């Protein structure tokens, strides 16, 4: 981290990204809907997008795409490789600026 926030909700992440973030700000947090797992909260166009991270026990990924041994390697990969996450239509979801 410090893009990793161990004790926030999706709501609390929204509030943080909206008040202390800029467009391209992001963080990872524990998932509500999958206990024990993680979710990326990403600000783009003044709003927040959430994306689940899968942990299979053998790797992490985004329920698709490249496989990683650790959450930090996942985050680094998508920070370094811009334009790998997209809406189907067709703007990019960029992890630009960790929110620490």
């Amino acid at each position: 981290r410090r893009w990793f926030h161990p004790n926030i909700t999706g709501v609390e992440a929204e509030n943080l990204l909206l008040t202390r973030g800029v467009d391209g700000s992001f963080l990872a947090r524990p998932s509500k809907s999958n206990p024990g797992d993680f979710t990326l909260s990403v600000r783009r166009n003044g709003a927040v997008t959430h994306i689940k991270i899968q942990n299979t026990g053998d790797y992490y990924d985004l329920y698709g795409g490249e496989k990683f041994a650790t959450l930090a390697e996942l985050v680094q990969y998508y920070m370094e490789h811009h334009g790998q996450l997209k809406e189907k239509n067709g703007d990019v979801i960029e992890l630009k600026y960790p929110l620490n």
Binding site: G10, V11, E14, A47, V48, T49, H50, I51, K52, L62, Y63, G64, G65, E87, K88, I93
Partner: peptide, 7 residues
């Protein structure tokens, strides 16, 4: 909260 999910 709005989730995005892969295609």
């Amino acid at each position: 909260v709005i989730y995005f999910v892969p295609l």
